Amino acid sequence: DKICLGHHAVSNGTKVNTLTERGVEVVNATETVERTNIPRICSKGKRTVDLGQCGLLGTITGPPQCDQFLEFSADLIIERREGSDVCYPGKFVNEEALRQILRESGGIDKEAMGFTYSGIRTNGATSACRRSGSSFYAEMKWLLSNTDNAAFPQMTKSYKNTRKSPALIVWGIHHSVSTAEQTKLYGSGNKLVTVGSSNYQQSFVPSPGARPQVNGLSGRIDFHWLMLNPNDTVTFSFNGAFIAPDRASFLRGKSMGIQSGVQVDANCEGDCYHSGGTIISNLPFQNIDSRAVGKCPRYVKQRSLLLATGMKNVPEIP
Amino acid sequence: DKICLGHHAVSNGTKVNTLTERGVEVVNATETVERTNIPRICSKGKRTVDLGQCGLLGTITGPPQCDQFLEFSADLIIERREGSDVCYPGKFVNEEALRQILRESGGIDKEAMGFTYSGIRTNGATSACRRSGSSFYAEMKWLLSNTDNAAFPQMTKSYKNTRKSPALIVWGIHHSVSTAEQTKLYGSGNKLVTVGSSNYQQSFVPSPGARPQVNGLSGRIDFHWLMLNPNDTVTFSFNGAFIAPDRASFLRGKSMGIQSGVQVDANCEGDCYHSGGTIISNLPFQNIDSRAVGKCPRYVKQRSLLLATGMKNVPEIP
Amino acid sequence: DKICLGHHAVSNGTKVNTLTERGVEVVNATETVERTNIPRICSKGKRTVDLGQCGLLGTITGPPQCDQFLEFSADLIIERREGSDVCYPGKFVNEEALRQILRESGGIDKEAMGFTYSGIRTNGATSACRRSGSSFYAEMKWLLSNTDNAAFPQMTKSYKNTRKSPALIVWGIHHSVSTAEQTKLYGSGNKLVTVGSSNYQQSFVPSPGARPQVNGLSGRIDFHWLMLNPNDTVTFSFNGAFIAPDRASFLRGKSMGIQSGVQVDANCEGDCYHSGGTIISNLPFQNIDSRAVGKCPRYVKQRSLLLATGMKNVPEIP
Amino acid sequence: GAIAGFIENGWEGLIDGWYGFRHQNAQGEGTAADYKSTQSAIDQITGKLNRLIEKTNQQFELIDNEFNEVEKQIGNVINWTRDSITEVWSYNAELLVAMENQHTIDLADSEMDKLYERVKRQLRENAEEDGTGCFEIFHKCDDDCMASIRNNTYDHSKYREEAMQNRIQ
Amino acid sequence: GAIAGFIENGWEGLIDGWYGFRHQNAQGEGTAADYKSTQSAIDQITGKLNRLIEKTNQQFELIDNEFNEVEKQIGNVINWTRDSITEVWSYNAELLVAMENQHTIDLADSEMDKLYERVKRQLRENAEEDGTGCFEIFHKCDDDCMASIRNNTYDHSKYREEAMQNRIQ
Amino acid sequence: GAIAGFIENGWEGLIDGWYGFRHQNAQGEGTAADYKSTQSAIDQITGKLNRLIEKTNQQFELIDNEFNEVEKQIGNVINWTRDSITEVWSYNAELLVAMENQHTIDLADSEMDKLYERVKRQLRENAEEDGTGCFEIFHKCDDDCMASIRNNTYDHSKYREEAMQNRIQ
Numbered sequence A, B, C: 001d002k003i004c005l006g007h008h009a010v011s012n013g014t015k016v017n018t019l020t021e022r023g024v025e026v027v028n029a030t031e032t033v034e035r036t037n038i039p040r041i042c043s044k045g046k047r048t049v050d051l052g053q054c055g056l057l058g059t060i061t062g063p064p065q066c067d068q069f070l071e072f073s074a075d076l077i078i079e080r081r082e083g084s085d086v087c088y089p090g091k092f093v094n095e096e097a098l099r100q101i102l103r104e105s106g107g108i109d110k111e112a113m114g115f116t117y118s119g120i121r122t123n124g125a126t127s128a129c130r131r132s133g134s135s136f137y138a139e140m141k142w143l144l145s146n147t148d149n150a151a152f153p154q155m156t157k158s159y160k161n162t163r164k165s166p167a168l169i170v171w172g173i174h175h176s177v178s179t180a181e182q183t184k185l186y187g188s189g190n191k192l193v194t195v196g197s198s199n200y201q202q203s204f205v206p207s208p209g210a211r212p213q214v215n216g217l218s219g220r221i222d223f224h225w226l227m228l229n230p231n232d233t234v235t236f237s238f239n240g241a242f243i244a245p246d247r248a249s250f251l252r253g254k255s256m257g258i259q260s261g262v263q264v265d266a267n268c269e270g271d272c273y274h275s276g277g278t279i280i281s282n283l284p285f286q287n288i289d290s291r292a293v294g295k296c297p298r299y300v301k302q303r304s305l306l307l308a309t310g311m312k313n314v315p316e317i318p
Numbered sequence D, E, F: 001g002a003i004a005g006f007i008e009n010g011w012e013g014l015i016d017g018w019y020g021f022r023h024q025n026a027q028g029e030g031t032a033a034d035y036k037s038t039q040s041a042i043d044q045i046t047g048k049l050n051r052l053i054e055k056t057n058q059q060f061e062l063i064d065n066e067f068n069e070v071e072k073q074i075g076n077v078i079n080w081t082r083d084s085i086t087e088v089w090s091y092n093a094e095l096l097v098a099m100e101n102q103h104t105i106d107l108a109d110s111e112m113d114k115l116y117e118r119v120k121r122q123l124r125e126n127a128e129e130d131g132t133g134c135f136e137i138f139h140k141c142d143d144d145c146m147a148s149i150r151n152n153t154y155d156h157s158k159y160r161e162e163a164m165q166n167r168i169q
């Protein structure tokens, strides 16, 4: 008569690593590193906007591409590679800092700044901003002299933020293809634009000159921005080459922005994104994308790290 | 006859975590995460200066608020929220880099740069720098033309650092409310200021224009700085709108700077600070402030991580 | 009759640390923290260039010191402290970003940009760039007016990158010692230089003024650069004070750059470098240099961390 | 036609538990799983699993741009920081799993010993170890007796006379 | 009115030590703490504590500003770096304590076994395990005899005849 | 002139192995190393070593400059990041070695116990523990008998009568 103590075992053993051994067989194991990607943006539960051809910074200035998004609202914001912030060729100064701000803004609320003009044209337009016909940035006014080569009057415009949130203010400096063109638009002489706040002081001079044709145009409009504190005032002093704002922007609340090249899905629910889709996993680590954002498992180099969920496998003596 | 082997146990058991269990009782445990804050700045043993209304950068230029600190010496430097670097409205370029430098300077030693002037006023003053009457920055000279609208002579001033430590040099560009005011002070025509070293080259043009009233004033003075290497020379070329230095600064030794809103205590001895006070602890971690500075336990998210200091608690069979 | 079970032991025991004890003796241990430095740059297998007196940025502009390296090729690039990017006094804007780019370029391929000039001198030279006699940067053209004080014609030059890699383009702004000297070289009036791409827009004005003598000279040439995308074009608009490029640069492939002050060795084979030499080790950590680059063990504070390679040492009862 | 326990070999037939009993008597051979030891091991392993599921509430946002590349200097600083942090987590991950796996294996070996030692203490002086994880029982142990050992209702006093006799001669 | 040892239950009355002895003889019941096993455990635990007290000499200074907020881009890079480093230390802290606690518990269980096994080796063939962490002593063991076991001065040769007799019949 | 095993003292004369046997019989005293236990320990320790040799393929490049110091703000951010990362690796290194060393020591103690327990199971009822890691053998065990124990060819059935006799009286 005999009684033996034993433990189970299999022929289906899987190898893992320990402090000592490499490839020690255990009875059962599970993966800790996620590699399974969902090639969609799972947006269920999240108010989602697909900017498409609209560049994120364009939502503030308003090229034709962004007409739908001038006061957009979102929990999840998606930039696309085809997106463009611009109709008339140019770029923002400190663009990326501004993008990062808008990605978590929750969208924007626009409000008129109430600038009035006299002895001056405001209908500056271009073929590059076609909206039915030639037009311009929807939130901006392209100011000219009045006739041609005529002198541009020195002007001063101010705006106080009477709200409880900071106001996003944007203006543009126009760089003509030639001093001849600058003169034709704003008159002769040097041109100066000053922007004053109570925590901000900057200055701007235009730079006329030949540049490569972009959208058929060799002129550039570069945009500038500041955040205006509550009850603070911005003042604009200028005498030409100034792209004035018509409305200011106010951040709605909270959101998250991503850059992606895959479709959206409002059926799937997710919380960790990358340009290739959504990572839904309870696993502590992932090997899909290091730049993934949201609430994510930590990115690792290894594609697989097996965690033993069973004892060491010891084959039965046959 | 019988002998039993056993171990102690309690009814006062405290729960901890392991690799496997969550809330396993042990006989005794201790906290590893500090949460106990001392709402004071424990300064015993440390030479401490409470800048109060004086902004740290103000110690170099010298508004009335910083008259006590023009050549201050410290082991521990404390900035306050009410502090201001400025009397006449303005700001430093690259301000934060300069603050970080002064926080560990050990204080400053001032030395005359020995600039002499002719055909020019140097008594530029303002109501915003009231010191008995109207005055100006103590370490700076506000240069004017001579009468009013009169031409400002082109000037060139140089200064060699004959010491073994780098010299902190500061100058200012004045931005008038209008070109009319700029002309009244420095004469007509464009204005240029050039600053040359042997490792530094920069240039400056003033930007007259209307700005919001700060301290009743719509003009701005923005300050610039460089570090002058030993035996190297700085040269100032200018023709107006130039706020000249009178003295240079030399760093005394070593210190640490903090920003705080609680009182100072010269009785308590500390080495880890945050805006809310001092963390004195032998514990490896703390959950008080992530931005705490000095010699500190590492900041963690968790408020509590209990370390077992005793065996597993097993209640006696009643 | 008796049989005993035992384990080996020594009098030559070495102390290590555990979770509990500090200085527990084990039979044998080995070091995990490398401290053994090879005071050479082990370059076997790697195509190595020792720039010596040539500064890395100088390889693009071409002072006499870099004549050997104008189209250099390397796997390993070594900067030296005596190196200089400059003959005529000046510096690059965004210098360090450019250095970081060249350190991993694999060297540079130069290609003519094909600029032609009329009504203008191009033989701008200086005593500071002595190459047999007075000369200038090898890859650049110092443009003047024609006679003296004569007007500099407005010019516009463009260049398209017809290759599949981005082109490194460099130009210079000349800052004269005085407006008198600026006028003597480029004529009277304000001077403007504009640089336009399809992703880049900048502008430049010279700043004449007295500066400390460097290499006997008080003028400064500061260099600027951009990367030109394939099929994109850069356009230069200027009327004086412009240091034009003659050739563009193309990155060869892949390399690594280091800064060192020790000799080179083509016999030793290495992969982890610092300014003091090469770290060759299978150990996981090192305590030699925190800023070491290449493929390295992780830097640690401790000079020694002994790993037990044997059991606990228990002395025999005598 | 002998049976053996742990110590050179597991049992591929024990399919209703992790640890178990295998006996042979006049009634034949049998195998049953022990609940308490198996459940202890499963509770500890699942305990590990849940601990590794505890999600983080830290949210991270974009710090650079893969359409419009950021400025070189700040971009290289960012990449250098990220790659540094990735090395750290890659190391942490590797070490965590290796450490946990070593512990999973060891506590499993531990449970096997605790079961064996328990049975040894039940049988007292009525059995001897065969050296393969089994006990030679020096008395008649039918299926009912074998079952009594498995549920700790075995009273060694009942078989002690009979067993000590057979052990001594 | 029986006594029991470790294995289902500790002793809330053992208040002068961590590990101890509990006996019953004609003189009655008694409990005393073992010094060597208790001191070993305390030395190892305090050893852990001191290791976690070893302060760092690395000093850190302000890298941003909570009165005058730094520039957005460099500020977001800084926040992203700090939060990343905080996640790392939060993880390290959690893992360290969990790991140390598992070890503290295990080495404590180990000391209990070493004490039990030592006593088992002292008593040789004069005792049997009852299965509750106790030894049934098959001879007369008065208080002086019980004390001799506690200080390892127990000579099993002295009681072996008497004990083996009572064990066999 | 007694011999003793593990439990207060190692053997400085065991120079051809980590674990071993030491006997005394009429033929005298002898010491030999056990291969299987020694090789197990060596394989596990070298296994640790190789695991710590697994080189990283991550390459790092210069992010600042020690000839021409970078801008103050970005330079302080870089230094703060590097020093932070150094603290992390310094901690990791310290913890890794301490953890591994604790494990190396423990698995070594484990191998010693497994060897001792194996021998105990070979000898069955023909021996008794002396309490110093040795076995008093209650029969004649010449060099050939001692060698049979070392290579697990010892049949306790052969000496059981003779041994049980000497044990009981």
Ligand SMILES: *[C@@H]1O[C@H](CO)[C@@H](O[C@@H]2O[C@H](CO)[C@@H](O)[C@H](O)[C@H]2NC(C)=O)[C@H](O)[C@H]1NC(C)=O
Residues within 6 Å of the ligand: A028, A029, A030, A309
């Ligand atoms: C092998 O391990 C896996 C992982 O633990 C086990 O699968 C789990 O099963 C439980 C209950 O059936 C589920 O709650 C888990 O979600 C499963 N995990 C996964 C990753 O699928 C599996 O049961 C184990 N094998 C055996 C035979 O028990």
Ligand SMILES: *[C@@H]1O[C@H](CO)[C@@H](O[C@@H]2O[C@H](CO)[C@@H](O)[C@H](O)[C@H]2NC(C)=O)[C@H](O)[C@H]1NC(C)=O
Residues within 6 Å of the ligand: B028, B029, B030, B309
């Ligand atoms: C429970 O654990 C704490 C922490 O180790 C013990 O308190 C320590 O006591 C020693 C000596 O009395 C002091 O040196 C430590 O500074 C104390 N630590 C703390 C955090 O106060 C306490 O003794 C333990 N409980 C018992 C009953 O021993």
Ligand SMILES: *[C@@H]1O[C@H](CO)[C@@H](O[C@@H]2O[C@H](CO)[C@@H](O)[C@H](O)[C@H]2NC(C)=O)[C@H](O)[C@H]1NC(C)=O
Residues within 6 Å of the ligand: C028, C029, C030, C309
């Ligand atoms: C003490 O430990 C060291 C480190 O493991 C041992 O030296 C190793 O020996 C093996 C084979 O001889 C080599 O493959 C390793 O490269 C050696 N390592 C080092 C760092 O030199 C040494 O053998 C150990 N001592 C004894 C007596 O075995």
Ligand SMILES: *[C@@H]1O[C@H](CO)[C@@H](O)[C@H](O)[C@H]1NC(C)=O
Residues within 6 Å of the ligand: A231
């Ligand atoms: C708002 O601004 C006005 C002037 O624009 C100023 O007098 C006042 O102090 C500010 N704050 C409040 C709360 O009104």
Ligand SMILES: *[C@@H]1O[C@H](CO)[C@@H](O)[C@H](O)[C@H]1NC(C)=O
Residues within 6 Å of the ligand: B231
């Ligand atoms: C100091 O400066 C002078 C000129 O200002 C220069 O000639 C000299 O080389 C410098 N160094 C020393 C050590 O004098």
Ligand SMILES: *[C@@H]1O[C@H](CO)[C@@H](O)[C@H](O)[C@H]1NC(C)=O
Residues within 6 Å of the ligand: C231
């Ligand atoms: C290249 O540039 C030309 C004009 O310079 C443009 O028309 C063309 O689209 C560009 N791309 C290709 C592939 O030719």
Ligand SMILES: *[C@@H]1O[C@H](CO)[C@@H](O)[C@H](O)[C@H]1NC(C)=O
Residues within 6 Å of the ligand: D069, D070, D071, D072, D073, D074, D075, D076, D079
């Ligand atoms: C950062 O890393 C990505 C991924 O390799 C690379 O494409 C990018 O160019 C890097 N950033 C910079 C500024 O080089």
Ligand SMILES: *[C@@H]1O[C@H](CO)[C@@H](O)[C@H](O)[C@H]1NC(C)=O
Residues within 6 Å of the ligand: E069, E070, E071, E072, E073, E074, E075, E076, E079
């Ligand atoms: C950095 O984090 C702090 C704490 O939440 C926040 O107040 C601050 O705005 C952040 N910095 C930037 C630039 O957003």
Ligand SMILES: *[C@@H]1O[C@H](CO)[C@@H](O)[C@H](O)[C@H]1NC(C)=O
Residues within 6 Å of the ligand: F069, F070, F071, F072, F073, F074, F075, F076, F079
């Ligand atoms: C970074 O650290 C090095 C090493 O101490 C130091 O020399 C350097 O000055 C630091 N960088 C800055 C910008 O202070």
